[PDB]
Design an enzyme around this catalytic site. Structure first.
Site, PDB file in Angstrom:
ATOM      1  N   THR A  79     -54.849  -7.460  66.337  1.00  0.00           N
ATOM      2  CA  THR A  79     -55.049  -6.210  65.613  1.00  0.00           C
ATOM      3  C   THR A  79     -56.324  -6.246  64.778  1.00  0.00           C
ATOM      4  OG1 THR A  79     -52.663  -5.807  65.541  1.00  0.00           O
ATOM      5  CG2 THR A  79     -54.034  -4.625  63.956  1.00  0.00           C
ATOM      6  N   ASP A 343     -45.608 -17.509  68.984  1.00  0.00           N
ATOM      7  CA  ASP A 343     -46.659 -17.403  67.978  1.00  0.00           C
ATOM      8  C   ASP A 343     -46.800 -18.693  67.182  1.00  0.00           C
ATOM      9  OD1 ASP A 343     -47.153 -14.840  68.813  1.00  0.00           O
ATOM     10  OD2 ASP A 343     -46.047 -13.875  67.180  1.00  0.00           O
TER      11      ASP A 343
END
Lengths: 465, 67, 80
Positions: A79, A343
């Site tokens: 992002t 992650d």
């Protein structure tokens, strides 16, 4: 007007960055996207938004390729890399009004990206892989963003111990595709078995005659299918015709040969790497040299799983490829756990390739913008003015974090430049257990310099078929 | 309810009484405990908590993309 | 469509009070949009609700009471 056509693509590219800008951070705003097929999905992840956005704009699709490489290399910051790309495009808009050619704009980003990394490494605290206390606290904080919290205490050493075996030294890039997260129905979070040798996705023969267990077995990969010294063989799953005949099961049962059929086609490429074997298309070319090495092959079922494990490959070319097994009751358990541990492996992957870590929350972006502003006087000509605009473009990441969190935009940004003057990396996110690896901040700037470059280098587009 | 909670934390009361309800049958304000209207705690807690869960997801949408 | 899934969540568990839940969530959206002209950030509106929701349950738990008034008064009589 070849430049005005490119300016139309820049405005269209900044509009995409403004849409993702509201989704930055855990407090960011969600985006509702309705697919043409009628599926309604929503999430704050920028990688999932740009994937299903179906962008028809040729230049705007570059942000999807950068976001794909952002997750494949660093694993975090998909992002923020889109917002950082839009900042350089907005700063280059004023450069074009001054009569500056985009080549100098693109060439100065190469020296600005390499300088920003060297400055970032000076303030970064170098860490070593020999310390296991730093890796546990690093992966445990990444698991606090998910519903699973108290059960993440046992998941921290699971991801750390798996990488340290394959880390060795000076390994540079470590592919996480070789680490497979096995999702099976049943069990709990506290039940986990590493099984460093390998873990399959399939069960064993449930018919009569199947040994289901073998000692001192050689496991090969056979893409063929038997239909109208090899102890264990694998059969590719084909729903068209029959995979393994029932008569062939009774034939190989007398020969004391373990059979595992219905092997998923997706795992054919995965097993050909970690096991160090080669695929066999035809029996005529099938030999013993393409087999594997296994000391013991058994089927252990915790609850309902009926899964076969293999240990001690002992291959010189192949390495210890580890597959992680994840158990859970509901389907939403093993799912959210899979993306949470994925992650965590990316954060550990950043420390293996590049040692050192920094404190997240936009802390380094403030000091780098301050140092490049003072060092801009050392340059001369058009390139000197670019360092000033490049430093202002790095402040959009910490500004957006203050906007999406409800805090005053301009007020928090001024407090960052004020506190970072006396102290160094002290603002306190270290007390809050917020640690962002240096490779994420390094790849975010590196991929942004190449993304903005590929944009401005397009002076026109025409129909080609 | 305003004057009812003034002397409540003081652990002393004279005319102060709590739990005033609304009776729509007789058109007057009486206590619902004596009136016979009672609801479990599970019903009110889950109704108030789930009402905000759907309200947050609506306010978080700044963009609508429809093909 | 979010309120549609919200209505099914109360029916599969409690089965009662679905009408009151929709009215509460409807008024919260009307007052939150009025704060846009006041330059109020939506996350603060969300955080302001989450902090108040945790403290509201604590205040509700203080006025909770078991079945009482069995002697000297009548409660379950007016129900039937």
């Amino acid at each position: 007007k070849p430049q005005e056509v490119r300016k139309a693509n820049i405005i269209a590219a900044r509009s995409v960055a403004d849409a993702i800008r509201t989704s930055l951070g855990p407090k960011g705003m969600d985006k509702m996207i309705k697919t043409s097929r009628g599926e309604i999905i929503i999430s704050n992840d920028g990688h999932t938004i740009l994937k299903q956005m179906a962008i028809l704009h040729p230049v705007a699709r570059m942000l999807v390729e950068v976001s794909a490489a952002q997750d494949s290399e660093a694993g975090d910051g998909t992002t923020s890399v889109v917002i950082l790309t839009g900042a350089l495009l907005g700063a280059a808009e004023r450069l074009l009004n001054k009569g500056i050619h985009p080549t100098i704009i693109a060439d100065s980003f190469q020296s600005a990206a390499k300088r920003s990394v060297d400055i970032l490494l000076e303030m970064c605290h170098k860490v070593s892989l020999s310390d296991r206390e730093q890796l546990v606290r690093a992966a445990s904080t990444s698991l606090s963003s998910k519903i699973v919290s108290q059960y993440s205490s046992f998941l921290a050493p699971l991801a750390v111990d798996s990488v340290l075996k394959i880390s060795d030294e000076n390994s540079k890039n470590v592919d996480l595709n070789d680490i497979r997260l096995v999702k099976k129905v049943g069990g709990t979070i506290d039940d986990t078995e590493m099984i460093d040798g390998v873990v399959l996705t399939q069960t064993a023969i449930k018919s009569a005659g199947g040994p289901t267990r073998k000692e001192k077995a050689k496991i090969g990969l056979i893409q063929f299918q038997i239909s109208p010294k090899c102890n264990v063989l694998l059969i590719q799953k084909s729903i068209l015709r029959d995979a393994v005949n029932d008569l062939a099961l009774h034939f190989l049962s007398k020969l004391n040969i373990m059979v595992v059929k219905d092997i998923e086609r997706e795992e054919i490429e995965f097993l050909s790497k970690g096991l160090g074997c080669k695929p066999i298309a035809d029996i005529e070319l099938f030999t013993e040299d393409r087999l594997g090495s296994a000391d013991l092959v058994e089927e252990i079922d915790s609850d309902g799983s009926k899964i076969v494990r293999v240990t001690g490959i002992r291959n010189n070319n192949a390495r210890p490829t580890v597959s992680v097994v994840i158990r859970g009751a509901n389907n939403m358990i093993i799912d959210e756990t899979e993306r949470s541990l994925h992650d965590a492996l990316c954060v550990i992957r950043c420390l293996v390739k590049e040692r050192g870590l920094i404190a997240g929350g936009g802390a380094p972006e403030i000091e780098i913008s301050r140092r490049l502003s003072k060092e801009a006087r050392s340059m001369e000509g058009v390139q000197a003015f670019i360092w000033q605009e490049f430093a202002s473009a790095l402040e959009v990441i910490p500004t957006t974090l203050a906007e999406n969190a409800g805090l005053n935009s301009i007020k928090v940004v001024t407090e960052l430049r004020s506190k970072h003057e006396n102290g160094e990396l002290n603002d306190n996110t270290y007390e809050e257990h917020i640690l962002q690896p240096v490779l994420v901040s390094t790849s975010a700037i590196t991929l942004a310099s190449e993304c903005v470059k590929s944009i401005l280098r397009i002076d026109d587009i025409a129909f080609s078929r | 309810h305003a004057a009812s909670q003034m002397a409540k934390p003081e652990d002393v009361k004279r005319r102060s009484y709590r739990n005033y309800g609304l009776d729509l049958i007789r058109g007057k304000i009486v206590d619902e405990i004596h009136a016979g209207v009672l609801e479990p705690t599970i019903s009110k807690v889950k109704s108030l908590k789930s009402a905000l869960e759907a309200c947050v997801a609506i306010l978080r949408i700044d963009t609508m993309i429809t093909v | 469509k979010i309120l549609v899934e919200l209505a099914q969540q109360q029916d599969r568990e409690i089965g009662d009070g679905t009408t009151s839940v929709v009215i509460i969530a409807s008024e919260l959206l009307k007052r939150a949009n009025e704060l846009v002209k006041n330059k109020i950030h939506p996350t603060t509106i969300i955080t302001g609700f989450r902090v108040a929701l945790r403290e509201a349950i604590r205040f509700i738990n203080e006025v909770l009471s078991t079945s009482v008034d069995t002697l000297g008064k009548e409660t379950l009589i007016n129900i039937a």
